[PDB]
Paper text:
The structural components of [name] are comprised of three proteins, glycoproteins E1 (58kDa), E2 (42–47kDa), and the [name] (31kDa). In this report, we have used a combination of cryo-electron tomography, sub-tomogram averaging and in vitro assembly studies to elucidate the three-dimensional structure and assembly of rubella virions. Instead, the structure of [name], as shown here, has an irregular helical organization of its surface glycoproteins and a pseudo-tetrameric inner nucleocapsid arrangement.
The atomic structure of the carboxy-terminal domain of the [name] is known and presumably forms the structural framework of the viral nucleocapsid. The cryo-electron density from about 20 isolated tetrameric units seen in the tomograms of the in vitro assembled nucleocapsid cores were re-oriented to a common orientation and averaged. The two top fitting orientations for the [name] in the averaged density are 180° apart, relative to each other, along an axis perpendicular to the two-fold axis of the capsid dimer. These best fitting conformations of the [name] are similar to the orientations of the [name] expected to be facing the viral membrane. As the N- and C-terminal domains of rubella [name] are similar in size, the remaining density of the averaged dumbbell shaped unit must be the location of the N-terminal domain of the [name]. Using these fitting results, it can be deduced that the disordered residues at the C-terminal end of the [name], not seen in its crystal structure, likely correspond to the thin strips of density visible in the cross-section of rubella virion tomograms, linking the inner nucleocapsid shell to the membrane anchored E2 signal peptide in the viral membrane. The dumbbell shape of the [name] also accounts for the double-layer appearance seen in the in vitro nucleocapsids.
Residue numbers in the entry:
A (entry chain A), B (entry chain B): 24 to 121
The structure:
């Protein structure tokens, strides 16, 4: 059972990039578990692919904490995080709920 | 349909839920503010839906340190987080390539 939400992300400087990210959320209900009751999905299931470039993925999946701006209006509002990853500055807009 | 990575997110306790998240990446070219300075209409345009429930989204984006790194079908590296938010304990896996 499916849901989705969209992010945006872009870097600065020479060779700057700009991506849309559609996060497709799938509810797996109650999957099979081991003893104790632990799930090990990274090893159980096949990942999607082919992968985007390495540095783009590291940047999107970076922790960054400091919400530094709020974009958009009304019901479609986005939190901006602003961070560097090895000399490259990134901006990442995340949908923020109510 | 272009470039893709996978994440995993799950909770413990009664009402535990389990989710696969596929992150679809679409290269949009140059960062959205040009030197003129006009905006790319692609930015925040046509967000996907419907959106996942608020506690799920919040959990997915909660700041949390990496507990450990794991593999990963095909020796693919993931960062793991183990954290609590809203009284609920969550586990999270994020694709993190080098």
């Amino acid at each position: 059972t499916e849901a989705c939400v969209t992010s945006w992300l872009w870097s600065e400087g020479e060779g700057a990039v700009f991506y849309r990210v559609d996060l497709h959320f799938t509810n797996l209900g109650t999957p099979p578990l081991d003893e104790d009751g632990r799930w090990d999905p990274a090893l159980m299931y096949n990942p999607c692919g082919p992968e985007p470039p390495a540095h783009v993925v590291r940047a999107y999946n970076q922790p960054a904490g400091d919400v530094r701006g709020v974009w958009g209006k009304g019901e479609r509002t986005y939190a901006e995080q602003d961070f560097r990853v090895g000399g490259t500055r990134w901006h990442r807009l995340l949908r923020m709920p109510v």
